[PDB]
Structure 1
Amino acid sequence: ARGPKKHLKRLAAPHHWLLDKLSGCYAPRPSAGPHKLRESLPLIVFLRNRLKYALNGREVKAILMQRHVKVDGKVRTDTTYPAGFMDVITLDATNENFRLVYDVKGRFAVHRITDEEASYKLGKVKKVQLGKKGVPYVVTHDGRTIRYPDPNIKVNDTVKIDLASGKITDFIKFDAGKLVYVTGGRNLGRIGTIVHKERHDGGFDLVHIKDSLDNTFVTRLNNVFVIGEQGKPYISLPKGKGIKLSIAEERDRRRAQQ
């Protein structure tokens, strides 16, 4: 009531952060930023719970204030800054470069990338319109506004964003035979090529998708992120490559390496 909430209890935090239910009543509430607080990862939980570079939030603040970490090339000395999908995170001490991509279990992965790849990111366009004085713009999935885009860029395409400038390098359209990333829903983390999309005028366009082992599935168009053509992706995929082995095959694979 009476205004915006500022706390976030543990057991209400998103489950993919993997915060243990003991050791505290509260979870780090993500501050307002480029990503929605459910589909986000604060820098405190990334630096402490995923990389183990700190033991406390106090140590995460001590890391942040000497301007070590920067996210998408900007410094961001904020504890609960929402780092989201496709953000690059640079740790100049250790010269490390991460990209936030999902593993197939549905959680954010520690995906180390090279220094050439940290110079860009992909963004899914959410709307194209005309701003004031008739200047067109696009809005990517992390809320970046890019003026004077290519006229061929319609919605649900991916644009390659330069991250030194905010300029657009190239772009991938939306049709059949395109490599997609599922970000959202039950199938979160899977990679498959799009076979066809269902019109459904009035709400919730569906799209059918099959992975490399020929397992089909279907997803709403809200959760699909095109990442290239079949064969080459435009980014480096994490380990596993979005395959979704069943639990039978998973314990068989674990009993191989054990």
Structure 2
Amino acid sequence: KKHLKRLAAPHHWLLDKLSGCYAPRPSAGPHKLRESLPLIVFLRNRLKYALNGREVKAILMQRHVKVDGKVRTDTTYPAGFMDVITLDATNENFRLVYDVKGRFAVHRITDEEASYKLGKVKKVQLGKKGVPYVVTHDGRTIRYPDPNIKVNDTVKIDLASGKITDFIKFDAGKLVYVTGGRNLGRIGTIVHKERHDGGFDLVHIKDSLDNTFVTRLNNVFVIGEQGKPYISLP
């Protein structure tokens, strides 16, 4: 199918249901459809910089928008979690993060913060010619990784060169962002990882208020150490 009804659109864009008959369908890209933010909604229905899709198209042909340091001209380009949107004409850098409500919240960041992003390690394996590499949550293949990097770790990637500057292991006491379930957008420190082999691993997380909640490991993204996040939080 090539058409998406506004009501049938998943929940997280915050789009009003009655604006029109159809909503933008995210195109193929780094992120899955159900957790992506196409540039049209980000520019029009969140920032309001544009009033209509045609104005958005003029904006993108002007090459004023950069996603992760690269100019994108597709209106429905699927920006997602830990994506840096740079607007040089106006001097803004934005990082896409879920809010406690579970919507993407437009968070201003510094240029140093813009220069890098964080990627959860989804897979680590040896490529052709015996070259190890890592696949992150955004589909980025990075070769010659540090040996200590494993699955469920988080790697700090420099956008300009796309290389690994530092990494965080998945361990108890680490600071964590929830990217799914009811707890989506919540932040807390790991307590215990409960393992079911052949099944979905479960992680217990305690917030700063001492409240505890359990979530599947797939919705877990390490973002730093307790009290020392590597990214600016909303």
Equivalent of 1:50 in 43, 46, 51: 46
What is the deviation of 1:151?
Answer: 0.9
Give aligned-pair identity as a percent: 100
TM normalised by structure 2 equals: 0.99
Equivalent of 2:89 in 93, 110, 128: 93
- Give the match's secondary structure for 1:146: strand
Alignment gaps of 5+ in structure 1: 239-258
Deviations 1:60-116 (A, max 9, x none): 111110000100000001100000000000011110000001111100001000111
Separation in 1 of the partners of 2:14 and 2:158?
A: 32
What is the deviation of 1:168?
Answer: 0.2
Separation in 2 of the partners of 1:78 and 1:180?
A: 32
Spell out structure 1 runs of 4+ moving beyond 3 A: none
What is the deviation of 1:23?
Answer: 2.4
Q: What is the aligned partner in structure 1 of residue 205 from structure 2?
A: 209
Larger radius of gyration, structure 1 or 2? 1
- Give the match's secondary structure for 1:235: coil
C-alpha RMSD of the superposition: 0.6
What is the deviation of 1:19?
Answer: 1.6
Separation in 2 of the partners of 1:6 and 1:127?
A: 31
Instruction: Say if 2:170 is the partner of 1:174.
Output: yes
Deviations 1:117-174 (A, max 9, x none): 1000000010001111111110000000000101111100000001000100000001
What is the deviation of 1:206?
Answer: 0.1
Comparing 8-17 with 48-57, greater Cα deviation is found at 8-17
Separation in 1 of the partners of 2:217 and 2:90?
A: 39
Separation in 1 of the partners of 2:100 and 2:19?
A: 28
- Give the match's secondary structure for 2:228: coil
Equivalenced residue count is 234
Deviations 1:24-46 (A, max 9, x none): 21110000000000001000000
What is the deviation of 1:21?
Answer: 1.6
Separation in 2 of the partners of 1:116 and 1:136?
A: 29
Q: What is the aligned partner in structure 1 of residue 34 from structure 2?
A: 38
Instruction: Say if 2:72 is the partner of 1:76.
Output: yes
Q: What is the aligned partner in structure 1 of residue 7 from structure 2?
A: 11
Matches within 5 A, 1:1-258: 5-238=1-234
Q: Which has the higher strand share?
A: 2
